[PDB]
Amino acid sequence: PQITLWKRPIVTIKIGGQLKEALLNTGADDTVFEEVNLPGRWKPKLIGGIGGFVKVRQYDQVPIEICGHKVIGTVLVGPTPTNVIGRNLMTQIGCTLNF
Amino acid sequence: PQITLWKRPIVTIKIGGQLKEALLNTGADDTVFEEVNLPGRWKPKLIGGIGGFVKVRQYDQVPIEICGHKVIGTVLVGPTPTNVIGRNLMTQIGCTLNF
Numbered sequence A, B: 001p002q003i004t005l006w007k008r009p010i011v012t013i014k015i016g017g018q019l020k021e022a023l024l025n026t027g028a029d030d031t032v033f034e035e036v037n038l039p040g041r042w043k044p045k046l047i048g049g050i051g052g053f054v055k056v057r058q059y060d061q062v063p064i065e066i067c068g069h070k071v072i073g074t075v076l077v078g079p080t081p082t083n084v085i086g087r088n089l090m091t092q093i094g095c096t097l098n099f
Ligand SMILES: CC(C)CN(C[C@@H](O)[C@H](Cc1ccccc1)NC(=O)O[C@H]1CO[C@H]2OCC[C@H]21)S(=O)(=O)c1ccc(N)cc1
Pocket: A023, A025, A027, A028, A029, A030, A080, A081, A082, A084, B025, B027, B028, B029, B030, B031, B032, B047, B048, B084, B086
């Protein structure tokens, strides 16, 4: 699809057996969800760094569906006001900026 | 141009008689630069909101050149680690997300 940027680019996600929404965020290196229950192994990751750090759970090679596009990528799980699809997963669906 | 997202989407900016770089950030509503000296009238704006607020100077209808595209939009001036082009100016250059 072609998504214009007059509104926040919020899209429908299937992740961890749940239906979610997330923001397409070209300013974020990483993808972060809260309130998902992912199976499999994880490792702790410190992210952020301003004010302190936040400790999140890093899950590798997570199957995820973004706008009907079934892809795989690293997902961080921790507190976030709006779930965020970062560049690490936008590359997987083939998403570019165009003008 | 078509910009892929394997790297941070940092582009060349002409603003306030200066050459700058800024990140194309679809997760940001607003555009924020530091260390620019913009002419004209401004008004205070509170942005952020997490940890406290940050007070910035809001300048309306600022002429700015983004990748050789000469456009106009609101620019906030305050502290930021990397200058940020938000949706308010990506719409002006006709930038979309595509996949
Ligand atoms: C400015 C970014 C570097 C900050 N981040 C995302 C950012 O886009 C959030 C988006 C966002 C979404 C969910 C959770 C946190 C942050 N919005 C934002 O701060 O935009 C500001 C710049 O212009 C202004 O206009 C509106 C807000 C102002 S960030 O996700 O925390 C981030 C910071 C550093 C890295 N390496 C990777 C990601």
